[PDB]
Design a protein around this nucleic acid. Sequence first.
DNA 1: AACCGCCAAGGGGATTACTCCCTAGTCTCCAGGCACGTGTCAGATATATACATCCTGAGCGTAATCATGGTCATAGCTGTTTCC
Length: 166
Amino acid sequence: LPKKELNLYVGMSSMQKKWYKKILEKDESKTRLLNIMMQLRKCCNHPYLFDGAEPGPPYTTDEHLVYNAAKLQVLDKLLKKLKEEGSRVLIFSQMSRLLDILEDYCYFRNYEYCRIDGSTAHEDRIQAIDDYNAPDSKKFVFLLTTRAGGLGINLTSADVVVLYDS
DNA sequence: AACCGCCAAGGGGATTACTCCCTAGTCTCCAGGCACGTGTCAGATATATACATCCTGAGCGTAATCATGGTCATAGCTGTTTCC
């Protein structure tokens, strides 16, 4: 059985277009751009990563996060579809900090999962893998990094794997 | 949460060649600024008064202390009662 591949070209969120211009035109201000590569990469990845895109002193946790994000709207659609389809999904990303927001947004949707990140533990890696690969595991999603997570482990219990970033 | 390894990629510091035009040296020139006389004014001088202010009690207020009274507690005395 082969594998399918689709590249979900989604438009960059209009809400963060303010800050994306604020990065291109150097408009928010008075910070580093020593690696314009990464700065645009983080804005390409997620807006709240720039330390002030989340204005709330209580830091509200609601649909605004998926609202202000370009990708998570398609993610929310695909998570709803794959939940009914029973697809056991794996998510890969580069920024461990971004995964915190996904961990927070996983809490919002109340999914079971296990978060493996660079330098979590030794026994925690084993146990989180076991719970995810446990038979009939309801851990519908699985947070994982890119350069720390997928270098030899087998996840045949899963079928669909999604990249947040390239 | 520092440390350390790791990872790729712009980024700008380095190097080479060249051009050029601006500053240097000279040189001609002259009036600006510096010495050189001089009066006048604004600080210095010399009193006198006005005033602030400190000093030390003139006195006044305040509290601290001793005096003084009243009051209650306890002890002593005796009268009453009951018992043999």
